[PDB]
Design a protein around this ligand. Structure first.
Ligand SMILES: *[C@@H]1O[C@H](CO)[C@@H](O[C@@H]2O[C@H](CO)[C@@H](O[C@@H]3O[C@H](CO[C@H]4O[C@H](CO[C@H]5O[C@H](CO)[C@@H](O)[C@H](O)[C@@H]5O[C@H]5O[C@H](CO)[C@@H](O)[C@H](O)[C@@H]5O)[C@@H](O)[C@H](O[C@H]5O[C@H](CO)[C@@H](O)[C@H](O)[C@@H]5O[C@H]5O[C@H](CO)[C@@H](O)[C@H](O)[C@@H]5O)[C@@H]4O)[C@@H](O)[C@H](O[C@H]4O[C@H](CO)[C@@H](O)[C@H](O)[C@@H]4O)[C@@H]3O)[C@H](O)[C@H]2NC(C)=O)[C@H](O)[C@H]1NC(C)=O
Lengths: 47, 119
């Protein structure tokens, strides 16, 4: 027998500061597969 | 880009042999097939045989079956060809040639600089 209730929203635009694992994305412009880079490896996802 | 630097063209006499090298770069020497197309005066560009540098697999042209011998040093990435029983007619400029891609050998976008043998 009330007036106001808890209402739950999913997709709410909020964020908090955080530390996390960051993966790499490369420009993929390195044509030569032979001459491959030490930092921009094949594991870097395409940009 | 890839490039196929070649040997100097030696001077020879009939009833002898010749060996002309061809070093490749810019691509994995094994993954792609290399050819030998020589050019004599006025005749159609003569293909002699392809060489697959995986296990030295080869396929020579019928008239050259017996004289021709295409090998390779997979370590120095060099392509070798020997041609015995020389003639003044088999005289030509020689060009090592790999295709556009490894899925098709016959589109020769990449040619080596001509090596001129004189007989
Ligand atoms: C699976 O199994 C297969 C089959 O077993 C294997 O296939 C075989 O592969 C080998 C390669 O590994 C291939 O070998 C051939 O070898 C040839 C080299 O032989 C030549 O030289 C010898 C030596 O003669 C000199 O030395 C002796 C003493 O050692 C002396 O007595 C001679 O007189 C001569 O000496 C001279 O110099 C000295 C210097 O001091 C002087 O003192 C002296 O006075 C002389 O001047 C010769 O014996 C050979 O002669 C044969 O071949 C010629 C070719 O015309 C014939 O005219 C000759 O009669 C003889 O042929 C004999 O056999 C045939 C066939 O049965 C008979 O009809 C005939 O009657 C004879 O009995 C050579 O001159 C090499 O040159 C050759 O390549 C050349 O030939 C081919 C054609 O055969 C050409 O297409 C090439 O372009 C070349 O020109 C070849 O490499 C075997 O031939 C081959 N087997 C078969 C059946 O083909 C295979 O390897 C194996 N494994 C695998 C993985 O497959």
């Amino acid at each position: 027998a009330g007036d106001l209730w808890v209402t739950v929203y999913y997709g709410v635009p909020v964020w908090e500061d955080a530390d996390t694992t960051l993966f790499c994305a490369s420009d993929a412009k390195a044509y030569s597969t032979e001459s491959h880079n030490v930092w921009a490896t094949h594991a870097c996802v395409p940009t | 880009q890839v490039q196929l630097v070649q040997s100097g063209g030696q001077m020879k006499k009939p009833g002898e042999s010749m060996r002309i090298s061809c070093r490749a770069s810019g691509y994995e020497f094994i993954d792609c097939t290399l050819n030998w197309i020589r050019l004599a005066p006025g005749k159609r560009p003569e293909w002699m045989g392809w060489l697959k540098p995986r296990g030295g697999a080869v396929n020579y042209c019928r008239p050259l079956q017996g004289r021709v011998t295409m090998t390779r040093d997979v370590y120095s990435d060099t392509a070798f060809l020997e041609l015995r029983s020389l003639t003044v007619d088999d005289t030509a400029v020689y060009f090592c040639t790999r295709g556009k891609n490894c899925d098709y050998n016959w589109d020769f976008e990449h040619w080596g600089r001509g090596t001129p043998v004189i007989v």
